[PDB]
Structure formats: C-alpha cells, structure tokens
Amino acid sequence: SVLVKSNEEGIQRVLTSDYAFLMESTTIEFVTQRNCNLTQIGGLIDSKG
Amino acid sequence: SPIDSADDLAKQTKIEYGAVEDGATMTFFKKSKISTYDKMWAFMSSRRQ
Structure with a gap:
C-alpha cells in the first residue's frame, strides 16, 4: 500500500490521497521550490552523504 | 497543564x-x-541537532 516503486508515483500519491511520502532532502527542496501546493515537515533526521 | 509530573514532559512537545x-x-x-x-x-x- 505505502511501498512505492518510483519517486513521481509517490508525488502523485502525496498529491491525491491522504498519504505522506518520504524523500531524502534535495528532491524535497526541488518540489517545494517547484510546486507551491507541497511542503516539508520537520528537519533532517539523518546525515547521508 | 503545569509540568510538575515527569509524564507531562512526554505529554507536551512545545517546551523543548x-x-x-x-x-x-x-x-x-x-x-x-x-x-x-x-x-x-x-x-x-530526534532533536540532537
């Protein structure tokens, strides 16, 4: 149900349903700079390089 | 509530x-x-940074 094969199908799932998608940091920055209907929650919870 | 209980710190998240x-x-x-x-x-x- 919540396990997503891709990135943009998760984008459509967070756009349509009552669903929260987890991306890392930078695609979050790209979709918040691009789309003004989406937002991030909290801070960076890890330090992956 | 007033935070005289130690469980009150687990109850709230505002006073970090x-x-x-x-x-x-x-x-x-x-x-x-x-x-x-x-x-x-x-x-x-979770708030170590």
Missing part, C-alpha cells in the same frame, strides 16, 4: 529540553526501557 552529554543523562535515557524515558530519548535524539 536538553541535557549535558553524560551517559547518566544520555545513555541511561537511551537504554533502561521506560516509556516516558523512551519519549525523552526520542525527543533528545
């Missing part, structure tokens, strides 16, 4: 908290599994 990095305040809060102390360790490690 920290501690000195000793293992009596960090490692002892990490292990020694008490549910409100699990909440304390979760808020300390």
Whole structure:
C-alpha cells in the first residue's frame, strides 16, 4: 500500500490521497521550490552523504 | 497543564529540553526501557541537532 516503486508515483500519491511520502532532502527542496501546493515537515533526521 | 509530573514532559512537545552529554543523562535515557524515558530519548535524539 505505502511501498512505492518510483519517486513521481509517490508525488502523485502525496498529491491525491491522504498519504505522506518520504524523500531524502534535495528532491524535497526541488518540489517545494517547484510546486507551491507541497511542503516539508520537520528537519533532517539523518546525515547521508 | 503545569509540568510538575515527569509524564507531562512526554505529554507536551512545545517546551523543548536538553541535557549535558553524560551517559547518566544520555545513555541511561537511551537504554533502561521506560516509556516516558523512551519519549525523552526520542525527543533528545530526534532533536540532537
């Protein structure tokens, strides 16, 4: 149900349903700079390089 | 509510908290599994930055 094969199908799932998608940091920055209907929650919870 | 209970710190999330990095305040809060102390360790490690 919540396990997503891709990135943009998760984008459509967070756009349509009552669903929260987890991306890392930078695609979050790209979709918040691009789309003004989406937002991030909290801070960076890890330090992956 | 007034925060005279230690469970009141687990109840709220607005008044944040920290501690000195000793293992009596960090490692002892990490292990020694008490549910409100699990909440304390979760808020300390999730807000470690």
